[PDB]
Amino acid sequence: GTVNWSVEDIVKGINSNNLESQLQATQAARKLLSREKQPPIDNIIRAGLIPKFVSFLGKTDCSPIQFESAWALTNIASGTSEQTKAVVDGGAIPAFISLLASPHAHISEQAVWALGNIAGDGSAFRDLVIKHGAIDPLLALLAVPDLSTLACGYLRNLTWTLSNLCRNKNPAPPLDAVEQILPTLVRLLHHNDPEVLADSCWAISYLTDGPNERIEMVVKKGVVPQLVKLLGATELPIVTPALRAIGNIVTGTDEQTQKVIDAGALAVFPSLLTNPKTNIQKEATWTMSNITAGRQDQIQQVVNHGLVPFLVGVLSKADFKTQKEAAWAITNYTSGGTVEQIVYLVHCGIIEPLMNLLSAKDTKIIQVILDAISNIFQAAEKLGETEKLSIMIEECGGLDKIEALQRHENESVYKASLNLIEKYF
């Protein structure tokens, strides 16, 4: 059998001068690396086997040893950066790229997978895979009229590897590589498999995680309507990256934000802002905070969609990280909104939940809240109602909390605290 070989025995077989002995030893190594918990990756490396495996990738006449060596190297490359580096250092990148053209789909798929692990190490190996020319043969595998004719597992591995070529920053992937990949990504983003959709969304989320020029090349491809549809998916693994991507996009320009609104995104946020998963709530409120930082007509669309009561709700009760994003959403709203928009905020009940959060042991939320209160008072001044507002704040325990903050270890806290207490109380 080929089960439970020692490393010593694998070495003896791979050093034989017999391709069939080498194949059996490579299989035994594959099974150590794939069938164990705590696979002995470092022992295999220390035995000097990586260069042998890499040379087996080139044995066109023995497709089984190509497959077994590709799988062994895939799992070595799945480990630590040092283990991935040993695979790269053995010459594996160009050997795997040559295997993308194999007429055996299971071998081409294993090469796709291995290159995804290498690229997933970080930006340097990602860019090194790209420089060895991986993108053209990868995209050629998806150049079919209908994706549904490809094996499902095959398409999932291809999508996953492409997403790693879009992943990581410092630096971001080369502009030319993004432009080359995007048309295929947009196609995968319309495919009816949940895992392909999830990894496609992740890739778009990476590509929109950057400056406005990066966001623009994604938005120009027309993907926002489809992101908004996927935002409505029942599968959490799809909603999570779709929401990340939409959230990134609205950190762009007000015109980029407006594409999200025009596509109907705000209609999904009653559900997102009440979502049972804490992380969805948090990222939805973060997204709202970058919408209320826009233009007054964009704030107005937040109002029209009925979302201000949902922000009051999360400020009133949510995980604290979400409550902090909600505080930011409120300060941005009050900094950019009209007087009538700010009045509406107060009629929805913002004051009390805002005051109760001044009990937080977190310095930054305090400043954010105090700045919003200031902005709300400035709106009342324009109306001559600073008094009714002072009462509201006192009536709910607000003045007491603002007073306590005059004795706060932070500079800008007790200065802004004092200024309100004197100018209005």
């Binding site: 690396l33 696979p39 895939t74 480990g79 997978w113 692990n117 997933g120 996953w160 990894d199």
Partner: peptide, 9 residues
Amino acid sequence: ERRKRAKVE
């Protein structure tokens, strides 16, 4: 999403 994936049995 996972940065790296082992092919396991």
